[PDB]
Each structure stands twice: as structure tokens, then as C-alpha cells.
Amino acid sequence: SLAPISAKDMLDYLACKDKKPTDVVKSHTEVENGKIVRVKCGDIVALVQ
Amino acid sequence: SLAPISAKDMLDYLACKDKKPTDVVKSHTEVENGKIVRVKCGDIVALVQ
Amino acid sequence: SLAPISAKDMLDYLACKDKKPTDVVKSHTEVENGKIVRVKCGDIVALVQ
Amino acid sequence: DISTVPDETYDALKLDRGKATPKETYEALVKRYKDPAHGAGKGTMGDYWEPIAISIYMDPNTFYKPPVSPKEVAERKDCVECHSDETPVWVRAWKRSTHANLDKIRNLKSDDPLYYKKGKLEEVENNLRSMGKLGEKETLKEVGCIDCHVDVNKKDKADHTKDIRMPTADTCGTCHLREFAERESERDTMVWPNGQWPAGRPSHALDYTANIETTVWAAMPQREVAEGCTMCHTNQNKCDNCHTRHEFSAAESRKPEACATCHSGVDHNNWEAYTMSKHGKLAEMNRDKWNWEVRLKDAFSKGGQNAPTCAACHMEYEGEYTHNITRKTRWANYPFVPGIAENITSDWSEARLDSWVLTCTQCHSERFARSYLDLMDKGTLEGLAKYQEANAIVHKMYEDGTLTGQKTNRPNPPEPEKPGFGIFTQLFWSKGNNPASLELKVLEMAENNLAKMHVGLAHVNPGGWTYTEGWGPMNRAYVEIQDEYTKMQELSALQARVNKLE
Amino acid sequence: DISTVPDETYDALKLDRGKATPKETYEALVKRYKDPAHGAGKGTMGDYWEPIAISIYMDPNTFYKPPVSPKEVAERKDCVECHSDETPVWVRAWKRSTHANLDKIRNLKSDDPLYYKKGKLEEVENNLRSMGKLGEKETLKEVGCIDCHVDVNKKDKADHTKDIRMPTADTCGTCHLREFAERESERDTMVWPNGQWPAGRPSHALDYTANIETTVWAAMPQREVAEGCTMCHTNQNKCDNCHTRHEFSAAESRKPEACATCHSGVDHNNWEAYTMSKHGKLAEMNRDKWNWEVRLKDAFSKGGQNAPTCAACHMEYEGEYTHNITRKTRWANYPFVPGIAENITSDWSEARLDSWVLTCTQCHSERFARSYLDLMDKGTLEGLAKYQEANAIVHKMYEDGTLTGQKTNRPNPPEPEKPGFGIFTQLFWSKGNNPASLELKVLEMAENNLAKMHVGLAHVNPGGWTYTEGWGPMNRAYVEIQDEYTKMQELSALQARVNKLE
Amino acid sequence: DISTVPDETYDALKLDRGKATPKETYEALVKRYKDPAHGAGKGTMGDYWEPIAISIYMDPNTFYKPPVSPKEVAERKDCVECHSDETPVWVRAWKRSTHANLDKIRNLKSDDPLYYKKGKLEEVENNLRSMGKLGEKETLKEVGCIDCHVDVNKKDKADHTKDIRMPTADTCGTCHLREFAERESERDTMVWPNGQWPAGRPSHALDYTANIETTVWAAMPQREVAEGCTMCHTNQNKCDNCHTRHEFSAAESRKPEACATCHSGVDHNNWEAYTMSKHGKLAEMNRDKWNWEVRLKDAFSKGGQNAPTCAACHMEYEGEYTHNITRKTRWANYPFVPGIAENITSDWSEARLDSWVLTCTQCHSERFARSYLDLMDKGTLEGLAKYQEANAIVHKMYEDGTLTGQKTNRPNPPEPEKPGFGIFTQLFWSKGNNPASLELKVLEMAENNLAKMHVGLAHVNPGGWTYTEGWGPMNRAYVEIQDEYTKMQELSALQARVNKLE
Ligand code: HEC
Ligand code: HEC
């Protein structure tokens, strides 16, 4: 009865909850090219709602 | 020194101890064609000797 | 810092520490050809020092 | 009315809480309790399975008949005398118990920490009077063999071959209406916002129904394996899994051990994670210092209790203790259940989190407790993510039809189960390459290792979500899934090269 | 007459129970006990292995010699004086033991639940008079360091470098003839109807013989690894594994924890399954309410013991308790041993099954006990069927010559082992592809997983035959075997095609 | 002078033990203790991670700030009054503590086994006088909330939003200079002859430093997973992991359960191995009999203790007990660390062996203890050999670049990690075929299975180095490594044939 949100997106969402949309956070789950993926709060809060 | 009996036969025997030889029971072990295998009692009663 | 010495050579050393150089002892770790490998104490006390 | 029972129960039972009597409440509770519609009986797959011999004690309402022998017509005193020989320890455990010593309870003085028991005795008499089982000025003299096993406060003789029953939850609830109603109230309080689980579930009120509505349970031929499942799922039917027969000691049900036989193992290792935490180890170290006879509400003051225990955390709600254990549930053990993780930030989950925080802050500051529960929620989701990645790979092979033996040797599971990818069935039934190895590896990754990582987190056992359970084993699953995926690709490649040459 | 020692032991010993004196019974027993043909010494593979330092303690009768220093010549009093310093706890533990306090025992009153010890003291004294170690008129003053470690009731000095021994079972049986005889009678009572196991096995009487008669133990080069096995197998030689030196407490030996160091682990998880059962959970919760000092015959009455324990189940036989633990054995742990499953319905098993019913019905009704024991038998057979299916596959591969490296890299095991399929040796020795992975998998499916399944069934731990041990792990083995089977077929079919083309 | 502190600690601090006052000793210890160059702060990889909410409790000196609410100013009594409602159990525990009842200790008589505590109280006071926290004629009144959480012996108001601290080791060590000094001295005693581990490691003094200087812990993105590692590595920062807040009972820190939350699990199973040995099972059976309140030095006399415990074995050194647990370490849990095995026969190891032998001879003869310690050393090397052989195989594959996905799907680990074979990071991070399955398997063989084998041997649990852990699991890993390797060689030959065919 809820839209599925992957666990990485939930985590990014929660990481951003106290934050401005232009703040950039580290992913809690993803590593690419030898570095933790950074995520922009605005882009993720957009993906959830 | 005992004649080897498989456990599936020990069990069918067990379930058939107290039946007519034309009574039919379910297997405790076997599934074939989406269904638990049915066993005619006289047959596994005969397998023990 | 220490010259590395493999675990089976350490065991063989320990099994020979008290031996004469010509004494033979059993391996604690090696089986070849269905049998415990035998080791001459002179060969092992040699390898360690 | 019953002061600790929820409004949503009175509502569901069409009762008005300002007017209902004990008799009325009991009768309504039982009417729901015995209705197949509401989960009694053999359930929807009743035609697929038959009871085994032990099934008469697991579900006595569906299966129990007394034995054909002895033929004895017996009075109250006879039960005790004959069983002193036939089942001697049952009699002795009974003699030692509160049920056989009610005048001791009557005599408890108000400076005794156990004083609340007198109130509970008087409440029980009130219930029975309302029910016409006890005279209004008649004291309940004992709860004896004949009372539980034939009829409460029975005056005359019983026929062994006809009148003997196994006492089920409605039988205990005749006297213990409060605890029975509290328990039954789980059906009404455990309602998910998006139907993540069926209403009333997970709960002790529906444990038996849950078990018999599990396809593989109903479908598998190995009845004796299946009945192991049933032995952890009988709370709905009988009240003695925590405080056991025949002492029925409340002190015993308060000890973490009382929950351990069911709440342990590969897919919910609460006993292991709790006992290994500092909380559990302090309970082990101080068990002999605490007074386990005091009620939960008095555990931390009169009981001298200084570390939490399963009952203290799970029976507590907003400052009171009840047999309803469902009201703070958020994660429900299995983090990968659809809608569970998405629900974690809802107002509904926040509300339950606040009730949790209130539990912890009996000892910790709120800032500390909220720091930890934040770690629990995000660590759970970190585990969920790692599994979700591995599952994408395997699920891809499935839809490709490329799992080992998927199209050559994958027989169907037993009826009424339907074939599917990584279903619960494949943990209790396998044949041929159903399931495939990768497929089982990924199911277990979620069912076992992710669920254990969550339980490690919730119960504050660091090794239980990092090295030893949860992350460590999930890492190996991931690694092995990746390895075999690649091995399987390079062999596919090589097979391709070969029918080219042909 | 030792009336708790079976006929078949006096027969085996060529004694008349009416006439034999304690001295004659002790000497006959000890003659058999110390005889190489009957299991003493290095056993039939003694040419393959040498003792290690710890071996002098594991098998003193073969290997012990006293130390070369201290050069000392000591009276009874000097042992205590010097060790107070040298091994202080041994003195402390001994000083607080019954051995050190025989007057306490002589003073027991007959209404004390411990009065029986006073009968046992006098029985010891009677034994010693018969052996000529005590005067007709002399009481046994104490059981001190010098008594056990040099000679019973020694009167003069001992030379520390020459006269000190490790007390073996025969040493204890000098005084404790009854218990020694009961334990030795396992040799005569444990006889299988069709040689399922060697006569007198499994038992504590022959545990060490069984150890040194295991090929891989004798053959493997890692002696310190092998000696871990010896550590679980020393009951035959020494009596202190359940009631340990130097307190020698009968109360300790009644506690489930006394059995757990040996009867635990991947191939017989008795401690684990029992402690997680309701039974063992209750034993944890009530250990402080039970009087462990009363004899097993009295545990349920005078001890207030209300849940069963290892010693109370396995030492009881037809209403009596003895150190013989073999008489009710039916499955003997490993359900795949040839002839065991098929003997499960014999008259012989059924009489043993009746003895077990007697045990359970101290508490449960007969109907309940038999319902459960029926589930244990059938659940074990279901386990067995499942492994049997798996072994068909892997065994076919071995005979077909198709295991991995079977033809190219399967070196032979160390002497005097012979190459075989799925043999005990492959659990403690591996080299190249001896064994192959599939072979070890299926060997472990029977030796470990099917065995734990059965232990879980027998000890009433539902998760220990369903999810966590037993069915779950066997399900995984079967699935991986089938999976590896199908893969290996696809690969040999693929290299048929590369062959065709060449 | 502090009689239990090693010379090398005074040397390291450039202090004269004959001369230094408590104040000076404290101040030198704290200067080192708080210095980044000595392990304090975020460590070398501090740029790669940020704290989560719970870290303010894990590393208070680096992260802790008081809460913004409540905005209140409080004196000593107000801490107690308000918290009596806001964190009620902390107030109840504290009231039960020695800390809150100093006059009791003061009134101890010299026939009381706890009498030593009054000497300790006077030592604390003298420490505080030297620091001028206490008048030379003032008695310490209590140790209350304000003392630990604000300032020792604080006479006035505290601002809740400014003056509140989490007590760290240096806070405790304000009064308990001896314990804190003994603890900090691990930095100076645990020095390896060939730098097998970094100076001062492993130890409780540097456990946090060790946690944050681990590449994967700094590099991985799953912060909540990584912080379960931090939970087991906080001793350096806070003194309440063995004797927990708010009771701070030394009796508690003496029980084996104190150590279990940390010293357990898949790569160091000391809890599991100890509890299952005879030593542990006796300690379980006998716990009710010992007086745990007596100091460790009196455990075996005044305490009644007759089986060994973690604290009694590991705090003991040459017949004394201190908080330094490093002085006898030889193997340090991981037998594969370069130089550890090679060092086992060194003079340095042999003096440390002699120290162990002394410990064991509290109870066993020297001969017995030396016999068993030899078996531990040699059994350890035999597991090491088995591992070394399996590693040669997979390690070859790595050099040949033949591991699955090695050249195709092996992404690099997160910064600041460097790609390599079988590195610790692959236990906590994985992506694609980094690591490969064989790689992880040989890694876990050493990390998990060889370490557990050594733990089992060191802790006298035979099943834990034979069947159940150590050898059996290593056996399986070896078998599956050989098996995969052969399959891979066969598939590599089959591929060679298919190029050649094209
Ligand atoms: C009336 C005929 C009763 C029936 C049927 C059952 N119980 Fe009872 N029990 C009853 C009373 C009056 C009391 C004393 C008041 C109190 O609650 O303490 C009890 C006591 C208990 C206890 C606590 C015993 C103790 O720890 O001191 C428990 C755990 C308990 N009772 C459980 C119980 C169960 C599970 C029943 C069904 C098998 C049951 N009781 C039936 C009265 C009656
Ligand atoms: C077996 C006879 C059990 C005993 C004894 C205890 N519990 Fe239990 N519990 C059991 C089952 C099979 C279930 C699930 C039922 C279902 O719907 O399938 C439960 C459920 C719980 C829950 C809720 C779980 C959730 O929401 O995920 C809780 C909080 C719970 N149980 C607690 C609990 C405690 C504290 C116990 C000892 C006092 C205890 N249970 C005993 C099985 C059994």
C-alpha cells in the first residue's frame, strides 16, 4: 500500500532530514570509483516526496 | 546384520502398521508432481519382508 | 623484522630442540604417500639458524 | 470495566466500557476467540494436513478428547490422591503453587511487596461472582486439578473419559479476565498503517493462526518437522509457555529465560543478542540480587532491578504493564517486509518510537536513548541495502530463466503452494534444483542474516550486527553471490563460443 | 552383593553375587578393567602414535611416572603443609570436601535428607576391611592427599619421586566399589541386538578405548589436535569429569553443566538443545530453589526439583539410579549408523522405549510422553530420509569416479587408514581433493546436521530440529548438493562437445 | 610512589617514582593521555569520517557537548532531586553504590574481608589533597552526580548547558590514580621484541586508537555498522565497561560476564570457549558460592573461589593484580600475525610463559600446567600450518591474476584504503568481485577459524579447537579451497582447448 523506496534512498533521506536542500551528504551505502558517493539533499528529498 | 530399510520405508511401514492392506496413506517424505506421494499400505507392508 | 619461518618448520624445530643432529622425528603437519613425513633434526636445526 | 484494556477492544467487541460486566466482557472475548472466522480451528488449508498425536495438546479446542482409560468417576480430592501416584511431580508442583495456596494470599499484609496478589485474588473472585461461578460471599478455596481440567469451582464428580479437558486461554481467562483481555487486545492494537502484516499480527493472540496459515507448514509431508514450528506457536491456544504448568509462577515468566525457547535461532536471535548485550550480562550477573516476585511495575524499586529484561521492555507501555506486547512494534523483526522500511519515518512509527524512548529513559537520558535508537534504525537500513543489492543480481537471473536447473530440474512445491522465486517454502521444502543455491543463499541473506543484524541492533549487541551476526555473514553472502554470478557468466560465454564452433 | 549391579556383570566376572566378598568383586573388576584385550593400554594402533606431555594425565595407568623433583619424603601431614603453598586451591578445595570431613558424615541424623552418606561411609569402610586396608575395629579417619595419591590408609612416609600416582577409576573404586562396578557394568549391559555398535559401546566405560581405536586419531600428525578428542574421552580412566577434583561434589555432578564440556558441539549438541528446551530453561531459572545435595532418588521429592536434568533422565532406569548410563539407549546419537533406524521398532527398542516412558511419567501423563516420543522417532526418520536422498547423489558420483580431483589429486590418508568415501577420517585430515567438497558436505549432512536434528528432537528444542539446527541446515546441504550436481553435469556435457569437435 | 605501577611508565613520563607526587603523576599521565600524538582525538584518518549522534558518548573528550535543554543552573542536591524523576533508576543505582555511601567504607572493621576498601578510600583522599581538590583535614563526603559530571568536590552551582561532562578515564583517575596509572601503563609494558604489533598494543589503554586507526572503520560508508566496532573499543575513553554505571561494583567487574560483550564472537570467542571449558562450567555451577566482593588477591582464600575466571587470570602478574592486562601476552589472539609464531620460542615469550605457569599453579602442579601450555602452543602452530598451506594456493592465484573477476570486476576499496589481497577491509566492505569468494574464504580461515582455534586451546575447551571450532571449520575451508582450485584449473584447461579450436 506504500510506494517502494530502496533502503539507500531511505538512508539518504534520513541523512538529509536536518539539512538544507543545497547541502551535500555522504551516502551511507554506496562506494564508486574508490570514494563514498556524495548526495545532494534537494535531489533526494525530491525522490522521496 | 539387519537387512537395510530406507527411512522413507520405515516411515511408510510405521503409518501402515495398523491399517487394512488396501488403505492408502500419505508419504512422510515424498513430493511428486506438486503433491505428497500416496502409499497403498499392502505394498510397503510387503516391502519389509 | 624477524626472518619468517613457516609454522611446520617451527613445529619441526620444537620437535628437535632436544635432539642429536642425526635423530629423525615425525612431522606434526605433513603426510605424503599415506605416511607421516619424517624429518632429520640436522636439516631443520640448520634451516632455522 | 478492565482499566488496562484498550478502547479499540471494547469497540471491536461492540461493548460499552462504562457498562460492560466481567461476564459480558468474557463472553464477548470468547465468542471472537472461538470463531473460525477470527482464526480458531484448522484454518483455510485445513484439508491439507491432519493432526499428529501431540496435536491434541497444541490445539486442544480443535483436537482434544480425554483418554478412554482410566474409567473413573472422581471428586476434587480424588484427582489429587490418584495423581500423587500417576503424575507425582505434577501434584507436588501444584501443591507448592499459589493456586493451591489461596489463604496465604488472603493473609498477605500491606507492607509485603507481594501484597498486590491479594487485590488480584479479589479481582478474580469478582469476575467469577459476575459469572455465577462463585457465591457473592463465597471465597474461592483453591484452583485445583478439577477446576482447570473440568470446570471452575466444580462441586461434584467428573467422568475421566468424558469431562477432562486441556485448559486453553479461555479456560484461564475465566478467572484471569484482565490478562486474557489484555492478550486478546493485541488483535485490535496491532494494526499496520498500510497492511504491512495482517491486522492483529505479529502477536501472541495470533501465533497459532499464523503458523497454520503458513503454506509450507500445511503442505509439507514431514509432519513431525512441521510440529516443531507449532510448538513455538501455541500462545494463542494455551497460557503456559511463559509461566509453565504446574507451578504457574509469575516470577518465572519475568525471567528472560521464559521467552528463550521460542525467541531464539537463525531468523530471530533475540535470546542470543539480548543475553550477550551488557543489559543481558548484567541480568545474568544480578539475577540473584533482584526480587523476581514483585510485579513488573515494582521491578525497578521494590525488586531492586537495575538492568532491563525482555518482559520489562516489551510489556511496558506508557507507564503501565500489560500482556499486550504489540504496541511499540515498528520493525517487526524482518526488515525486508514490503512497506516496513518505508513506514519507518511515518507519524505512526514516530509515535511508537516515543513510547520506546519513554521505556529507555527509566534509566538513560533521552538524548542517549534517541542517539542509540537512531543508530538502530539506520544500521537496520544499511543491512537492508546490502541485501537489496545482492537480491537484484539473483532476481535478474530468475527473470532471465538462467538459475541452475531453472528450466531443466525445478519441480513444483507441494499443494497448495504455487512456484515462485525465493519464497518461504524453499526453507522447509527442497527437491531437485528448487530452490537453486544462489536463490536459497539470497533468501537466507534476508530471512536469517539481515533479520539477525536487526535483532543485534535492537538489543544492543555490537558483535551481533558487525563481526559475528548481520554484517559479517551478509558480506560473505554478497561476495559469494557476486563470485558465482561472474563464474556463471564466464561459463555462459564459453558455452556460447562452443555452439558457435558448432 | 551389590544389588544395583546387573547379573550379567557377575556372570561376565565368573562370580556368585551371594558369595563374592568386596575384595573379590573389586579384583575381578580390576582384572578386566586393566586388561589390554578389554581396552586398556595403547590399543590396536599403538604403533602409530606416542603420548604427549598431557598424556600422563589422560591415561595415567599407561603413561604416568611421578616427577623427578621435589626430591622429598613426606608423611600424611606434610602433603597438606607443603601444598598449602605449592597448589593452594587443591588444599582449600580438599579441606572443604566430604573426603576431608568424614566425622561430619558420621554425625548425620536419620531425618536429614543427606543421611544416606553415612550408609555410604560405612559401606566404604566395609569394603576396605574386606580388602585388608582397614582394621576390623578401625574407622577411616579421612580421605587425604596421601590416600588417593599413594595408597589408601597409608600409615607411613612416601617418597615423592617414587610413590606418587594419578588416581585412576580403580583407585577410586577401592573405596567406591558400588559406583565403579555400576560404571564397569556398561561393558555388559550395552549389547546391541545386531552389533549396531561394538558390545559395551557407546559408554563411559569404554570412551577412551573408543578414542584410541579411532583410526584418524591414531594416524593424524597433529597430536595436540588429537588430544582435544582425548580430553572428552577420559571417563574410562579417571572419575573426576562430572564431580571434579578436588572438591569431589556429588551436587556438582548432578548439575547439567557437569556434562556440557563433552556433550556439546557440531556432532552432538546436547548441552545446546537441552538448555534451550523448556526443561533446561526451567533448570536455569530454578537452580537456586533446588536442593542439589540430595540424591537423585530424592531430587523430585526432597530436592523440590521440578524440571528434569541430564543426570536425572540418563542415570534413572526402572526406578533406580546408577552410574550406568546405557540401558535406555535406542538411537545413540547418530541416526544413520547401519541397523539403528531399522532396529527402532524391534522388541528390544520398544522395551527401552517403555523405560523412557517411566522416566517422563514422573511428571507427564503417559499419553503425553508417548505422543512426544513418537514425534521424536518419526522426526528422526524424516531427517534420515532427507540425507539418504542426498547421499544417493554423492555416493553415485564417488562410485562413477566423478568427484572433483577424484582421479587426479586424491592422495591416500595417513596409515593405517584405507581410502574410502565419506569416511570419518576426512573430518580431521584433508590433502589435495581428499575429500572432495561435495563429499565433505554430505558427510557433514549426516555426522553433524542429522545428528543435531535428532538431539534437538530428543531434548525437546523445537528450533533445534527445525530452523536453526536439523532441517534448515540439512535443507541447505541438499540444495547445494543438487546445485553442484546439476552444474557438474552441464560442465561434463560441455566438455563432451569440445571432445566431439576435436 | 604507586607500588603497582611499572618502572617503565615512570621512565616514559620522565618522572622519578621516589619523588613524584600524586598531582604530578596524574598530570604527566593525562598530558600523554590527551595528546593526539599518543592516540587522543580523531586519529590519522580523521578527515575521512564524522561522528554520529552516539559518538559523543563513545569519545566524549573529542565530541561531547552538554544538552541545550534543560536551561537550568543546579547545586549538588538538585542533580539528585530532579534526576530522581528524569532518570529514576540511575538515582536508585547510585544510591546503592559505594560512591554514595563512603561512611560505610570508613566504618569497616579489620575482620571484615572488605576492609581493604578503607585503605583505598584514604588513598583517594590523599590523592585529592595532593591535587588540592580536598582540604588536608577534609573527608571526601560522597562521589555524587556533580563530582563525576561537573568537577570533583564541586562546592557550588553548575550550569546544565555548560558544565556537564561525560566522565572519561582521566575523570575517574582524578581519585583512582592507581587504577588509571596501572591501566595507562599498558602503553609502556606491551612492547613487542620485533614490533609484531604497534607499541602499547593490544591493550585497553589504546583500544579506541586501534579502532579509529583501522582503515575500513574510517573508510566505510555504513557509519552505524562501524560504530558497533566502536562500542567494543571504548575502554581507552571510559572506565564503565567492566564495572558499569551507575553502580560501579568491583564485584561485578570480577565476574566473567563483565568481559563477554566485547571478548566474544567470530574472531575471538573467549566467552564461548571459556564458558564451555570445565573452568567456565565450574564458575557457572559455583558462582553462588564465592564471595565476589573480596579483592582478586583474596579470591582464592577469602573468596572461596575454586575455578579460574577471566579477571583472575588476566589481571594477575607475579602474584599481584593490577588493571594492566598485557604483561603475559604471547600469542595475542591472531596466530598468523608476522613474527608472532617465530617469536614463540624467544626468551621474551618464555619469561611470559613462566608467568602464566605461576598463575595456573594457584591450583595445578607446575608439571600439569606446563604440559597443557605446551599443547596450546603446538596446537596453535598446527592450525597455523594448515592455514599457511591453503593460503599458498589462493595467494598464487592472486599473483597469476586468476581469481574470479580479478581483472574484470574488482573495484577499489573506499579511500583511504589501497587495493591488495585478503586485507581486513574485505571483511567489512565488498563490491563486485572485490573480494573473490576464495579470497574471502582463506581470509576468514585465518581471521576467524584459526583465531578461534587458538582461543579454544588457550581456554581449555576441547570441542573449540577440534570438532566445533578451529580444526573442523579449517578442514572445511581447506577442502573447499582445493576443490574450487581444481575446478578452476579444469575450466581453465577447457577454455585453452576452445581458443586452440578457434
Ligand atoms: C480461578 C478458578 C483460576 C483459574 C481457572 C486459573 N487461575 Fe491463576 N490464579 C488464580 C488466583 C486467584 C491467583 C492469585 C492472585 C494472583 O494473580 O496472584 C492466581 C495466581 C496465578 C499466577 C501467579 C502465581 C504467582 O506467581 O504467585 C499465575 C501466573 C497464574 N495464576 C496463571 C494461571 C493460568 C495460566 C491459568 C490457566 C492455566 C490459571 N492461572 C487458571 C485463579 C485462577
Ligand atoms: C512460544 C511458545 C513463545 C513464547 C514462550 C514467547 N513468545 Fe513472543 N512470539 C512468539 C511467536 C511465534 C510470535 C510471532 C507470532 C506471529 O504473529 O507470527 C511472537 C511475537 C512476539 C512479539 C511481537 C513480534 C513482532 O512484532 O515482530 C513480541 C514483542 C514478543 N513475542 C515478546 C515475547 C516476550 C517478551 C516473551 C517472554 C516474556 C515471549 N514473547 C514469549 C512465540 C513465543
Ligand code: HEC
Ligand atoms: C529494552 C532495553 C529491551 C529488552 C531488555 C529487550 N528488548 Fe526486544 N526490542 C527492543 C527494541 C528497542 C526493539 C526494536 C523495536 C522496534 O520495532 O523498533 C525490540 C524488538 C523485539 C522484537 C520484535 C518486536 C518489536 O518491538 O519490533 C521481539 C520479538 C523482541 N524484541 C523480543 C525480545 C526478547 C525475547 C527479549 C529477551 C530475550 C528482548 N526482546 C529484550 C527492546 C528490548
Ligand code: HEC
Ligand atoms: C558423570 C557422567 C559421572 C561420572 C563419569 C562419574 N560419576 Fe559419580 N556421580 C555422578 C552423579 C550424577 C552422582 C549423584 C548420583 C545420585 O544418585 O545422586 C554421582 C555420585 C557419586 C558418588 C556418591 C557420593 C554421594 O552421593 O554422597 C560416588 C562415590 C561417585 N559418584 C564415585 C564415582 C566414581 C568412582 C566414578 C568413576 C568410576 C564416578 N563416580 C564417575 C556422576 C558421575
Ligand code: HEC
Ligand atoms: C583454580 C582456581 C584453577 C586455576 C588457576 C586453573 N585451573 Fe585448570 N582446572 C581447575 C579445576 C577445579 C579443574 C577441573 C578438574 C577436573 O576434574 O576436570 C581444572 C581443569 C583443567 C584442565 C582439564 C583437565 C581434565 O582433566 O580434563 C586443564 C587442561 C586445565 N585446567 C589447565 C589449566 C591451565 C593451563 C591453567 C593456567 C592458564 C589453569 N588450568 C588454571 C582449577 C584451576
Ligand code: HEC
Ligand atoms: C581422591 C579423592 C583425591 C584426593 C584426596 C586428592 N586428590 Fe589430587 N588428584 C585426584 C585426581 C582424580 C587427580 C586427576 C588425575 C588425572 O589423571 O588427571 C588428581 C591430581 C592432582 C594433581 C595433579 C593434576 C592437577 O590438576 O594439578 C595434584 C598436584 C594433586 N592432585 C594434588 C593433591 C593434593 C595436594 C591433595 C591433598 C590436599 C590431593 N591432591 C588430594 C584425586 C585426589
Ligand code: HEC
Ligand atoms: C614440599 C616441598 C612438598 C611436600 C612435603 C609434598 N609435595 Fe607434592 N609436589 C610438590 C611440588 C613442589 C610439586 C610440583 C612438581 C611439578 O609440578 O613439577 C608437587 C607435585 C605433586 C603432585 C602433582 C604431580 C604431578 O603433576 O605429576 C601431586 C599429586 C603431589 N605432589 C602429591 C603429594 C603428596 C600425596 C604428598 C604427601 C605424600 C606430597 N605431595 C608432599 C611439593 C611437596
Ligand code: ISW
Ligand atoms: C516452521 C515451518 C515455521 C512456521 C510455519 C512458522 N514459524 Fe515462526 N516465529 C516467528 C515468526 C513467524 C511468522 C510471522 C508472523 C505472522 O505471520 O503473524 C509466521 C507465519 C511463522 N513464524 C510460522 C516469531 C516472531 C519473530 C519476531 O520477532 O517477530 C517467533 C518467536 C517464531 C518462533 C518459531 C520457532 C521457535 C524456535 C520455530 C521452530 C518457528 N518459529 C518455525 C516456523
Ligand code: ISW
Ligand atoms: C569493526 C570494523 C572493527 C574494527 C575497526 C576493530 N574491531 Fe575489534 N577486537 C579486538 C581486536 C582488534 C584489533 C587488533 C588490536 C590492535 O590493532 O591494536 C583492531 C585494530 C580492532 N579490533 C578494530 C579484540 C582483541 C582480540 C584479542 O584477544 O587480542 C577484541 C576483544 C575486539 C572486539 C570487537 C567487538 C566486540 C564485539 C567488535 C564489534 C569488533 N571488535 C569489530 C572490529
